[PDB]
Write a protein that binds this ligand. Structure first.
Ligand SMILES: NC(=O)c1ccc[n+]([C@@H]2O[C@H](COP(=O)([O-])OP(=O)(O)OC[C@H]3O[C@@H](n4cnc5c(N)ncnc54)[C@H](O)[C@@H]3O)[C@@H](O)[C@H]2O)c1
Ligand SMILES: NC(=O)c1ccc[n+]([C@@H]2O[C@H](COP(=O)([O-])OP(=O)(O)OC[C@H]3O[C@@H](n4cnc5c(N)ncnc54)[C@H](O)[C@@H]3O)[C@@H](O)[C@H]2O)c1
Lengths: 254, 242
């Protein structure tokens, strides 16, 4: 009947069809005291499909950034330095990417980096191999995945079974100087574990959009030279927020 | 005649005025594209960087990491673009230009371009739509130069180029310093005609002038296009064979 958009595509679709006199509420980025509700992002309702490509484009970005150290080369140049040897990087062609959770973003990531000649292996408890083989991902168990990977990237939801999906046990099986990406949720990579991997050279780089705490209190990872980061930007494009603004409003009419 | 390796090269090579001063000199051996060269020695590595630069421009990754590293969390400031459905202009359609094209095509990008000695039908084969340079400029969200440094290619992007570009055209140069007119690119960056630029290369290396490296909407590297373990290895052999 009456809905507030706490936080222009949404207002229009909803009208076409201070929360004291409100039936519904909409947001993007709701405490127990505050309590149909809708989130523009990934009876409560959200827009699962809206941020899929935009989160998937960031990941490919993180991957190439980790391969050629672009954000650490930029900061070097901006400090007036010309540091050639330091930033000797890695070629993606013929490397093996490991992808955890092959939902909406996993396959978008996988196909894209296939274009760069990356061999894409993967693992997912629900998505079948018949489905993964259709977008060039050979599914194997996690124990056959670790020692093959030059890069590993995570596109699973945050559950107990994924909370610490990459820990010390997993790093111990990976190739020396594995590179790692988390553009999904804070906690799927154990932050405790990723520092130790970084500190011993076991992990060669890391690209984080997400932290168990946001903003992260402990700065051990952010400040580490071989760690590049963003302030949870996976879903920060004009394209994505347009599509999430609609997907939510279309449902509210339904 | 013996051989001398001045610059920093990959071991495999060894195992397997200046010109004027040397009477014994018959052959200068270059490890790269830039007399013998390694034409397809470091094309991929270069293409892979170019593609990274486009990515970093689209989502302000270098800047965002600096922001985090300065103990800042500012979501609003780092609003980025989605490459899917955007148009990438590829000036020069050789080894690198086509490898860039097929990689970015995979992000659902429209690839238009220009190369004089490459026909529209050949570029068609690797997915790039050749049109006259005038028609190119206004269609582009993203421009990348992959030409040799030539008189004609010196300031190939100039004030006349940006005149015909979209408000907020983001530009990449992992080819040579000068191909993009540095003076032009700064004026464009200042008027916000060019939303941002990404540079591997400079007219002076290192550059004396800091206007472009310092600009907030510019990203940089100290000529890291050929700077992968794999690329230097291939080139090293690829010239030691020649
Ligand atoms: N970085 C951002 O700003 C941003 C924005 C949007 C999405 N995300 C996150 O990205 C993740 C994936 O999004 P999506 O749309 O691709 O999800 P999806 O729901 O489409 O797919 C999730 C997949 O993960 C798989 N999975 C679950 N547990 C697993 C495990 N233990 N091992 C392997 N696979 C497992 C599921 O079977 C499923 O295939 C989510 O965590 C989502 O919140 C982050
Ligand atoms: N950043 C780096 O470290 C790095 C590494 C490799 C190569 N490069 C440079 O990148 C450039 C491209 O190398 P390549 O491997 O593609 O060489 P290439 O010769 O295979 O391709 C360049 C193409 O540009 C075409 N061309 C000539 N004049 C043109 C014009 N006016 N407009 C458009 N196209 C024109 C040529 O005909 C040729 O087909 C070279 O200048 C090379 O030195 C840079």
């Amino acid at each position: 009947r009456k809905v507030l958009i706490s936080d222009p595509c949404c207002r229009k679709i909803l009208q076409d069809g201070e929360l004291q006199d409100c039936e519904g509420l909409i947001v993007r980025s709701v405490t127990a005291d505050v309590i149909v509700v809708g989130r523009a992002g990934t009876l409560v309702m959200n827009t699962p499909n809206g941020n899929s490509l935009s989160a998937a484009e960031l990941t490919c970005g993180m991957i190439m950034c980790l391969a050629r150290q672009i954000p650490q080369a930029t900061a070097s140049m901006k400090d007036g330095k010309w540091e050639r040897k330091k930033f000797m990087g890695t070629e993606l062609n013929g490397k093996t990417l490991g992808i955890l959770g092959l939902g909406r973003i996993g396959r978008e990531v996988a196909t894209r980096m296939q274009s760069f000649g990356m061999k894409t292996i993967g693992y997912d408890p629900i998505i079948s191999p018949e489905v993964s083989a259709s977008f060039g991902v050979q599914q194997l168990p996690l124990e056959e995945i670790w020692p093959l990977c030059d890069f590993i990237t995570v596109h699973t939801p945050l559950l107990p079974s994924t909370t610490g999906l990459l820990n010390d046990n997993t790093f111990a099986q990976c190739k020396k100087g594995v590179r790692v990406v988390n553009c999904a949720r804070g906690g799927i990579v154990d932050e405790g574990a990723l520092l130790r991997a970084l500190q011993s050279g076991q992990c060669a780089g890391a690209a984080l959009d997400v932290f168990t705490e946001e903003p992260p209190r402990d700065r051990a990872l952010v400040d580490h030279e071989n760690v590049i980061s963003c302030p949870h930007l996976g879903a920060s494009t004009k394209e994505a927020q347009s599509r999430c603004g609609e997907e939510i409003a279309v449902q509210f009419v339904d």
